[PDB]
């Protein structure tokens, strides 16, 4: 029945645990972050066609490695939530195999049909990218308003879904102190954020823009100052957050 469109899949040791995570990067994203790591995930009509059956046969070989703490599967890519029906089925097949499931998303949910709730029932962890609390800047950095992502976040809180937050720090855009406080405050109130990951801006994936003959509006911006990272981090910890930077 449901077929999925993916950019790729790779197994990888979870940043902090002995387990391995099988990560499937779903094809397609409606955002256009100036710093996008892989713009090749943008096209919703690209990638490869795979069935739930196909992915599970790829995850099995890694089974022994997923029963270790952070071991499990992750739906990432561009925006995995755009293919919410398939991810639901994938996660359902994984749940019966005794596998931990993580939904890595930007939360750019357009409509709130029941499939989302179904998806969450079989989602052990939601990794939410919060790109910018100041919508003025968010529009300029991403190309869309953060309103939907923000509603989605509140949606997850009211459901008591365990959430980790990811925030990309970029000098001149998200290094602002007023923005760190807005983020720390907002996530504090959600009440379900268990940890925040601070990622310093990186000019990686730039060859994907130039390759497709496109202009990168951040080729002149450099990573954030080691001190600046400590600044925002310290600000977020004031709201009672574990910042795993
Ligand atoms: C840039 C960090 S990645 C682990 C996630 C990139 C983007 N938010 C995505 O989920 O497609
Ligand atoms: S949400 Fe992720 S995949 Fe989509 S444009 Fe932004 S960085 Fe790229």
From Swiss-Prot:
It holds the Pfam family Fer4_12. SUPFAM superfamilies: Radical SAM enzymes (SSF102114). S-adenosyl-L-methionine binds at residues 35-37, 78, 129-131, 202. The keyword S-adenosyl-L-methionine applies. InterPro entries: Aldolase_TIM, Organic_radical-activating, Organic_radical_activase, PFL1_activating, Pyruvate_for-lyase_activase, Radical_activat_CS, rSAM. One of its GO terms (molecular function) is [formate-C-acetyltransferase]-activating enzyme activity. Residues 15-238 form the Radical SAM core domain. It is found in: Cytoplasm. Its EC number is 1.97.1.4. Belongs to the organic radical-activating enzymes family. Activation of pyruvate formate-lyase 1 under anaerobic conditions by generation of an organic free radical, using S-adenosylmethionine and reduced flavodoxin as cosubstrates to produce 5'-deoxy-adenosine. This is Pyruvate formate-lyase 1-activating enzyme.
């Amino acid at each position: 029945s449901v077929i999925g469109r993916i950019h790729s899949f790779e197994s990888c040791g979870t940043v902090d645990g002995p387990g391995i995570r099988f990560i499937t990067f779903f094809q397609g994203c409606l955002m256009r972050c100036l710093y996008c790591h892989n713009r090749d995930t943008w096209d919703t009509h690209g990638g490869k066609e795979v069935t739930v059956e196909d992915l599970m046969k790829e995850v099995v070989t890694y089974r022994h490695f997923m029963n270790a703490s952070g071991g499990g599967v992750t739906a990432s890519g561009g925006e995995a939530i755009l293919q919410a029906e398939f991810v639901r089925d994938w996660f359902r097949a994984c749940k019966k195999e005794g596998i931990h499931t993580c939904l890595d998303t930007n939360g750019f949910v357009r409509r709130y049909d029941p499939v989302i709730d179904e998806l969450l029932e079989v989602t052990d962890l939601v990794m939410l990218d919060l790109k910018q609390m100041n919508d003025e800047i968010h529009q300029n950095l991403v190309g869309v308003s953060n309103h939907r992502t923000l509603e989605f976040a509140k949606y997850l809180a009211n459901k008591n879904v365990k959430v980790w937050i990811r925030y990309v720090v970029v000098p001149g855009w998200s290094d602002d102190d007023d923005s760190a406080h807005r983020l720390g405050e907002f996530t504090r109130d959600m009440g379900n954020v268990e940890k925040i990951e601070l990622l310093p801006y990186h000019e990686l994936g730039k060859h994907k823009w130039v390759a497709m003959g496109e202009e990168y509006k951040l080729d002149g911006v450099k990573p954030p100052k080691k001190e600046t990272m400590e600044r925002v981090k310290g600000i977020l910890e004031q709201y009672g957050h574990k910042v795993m930077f």
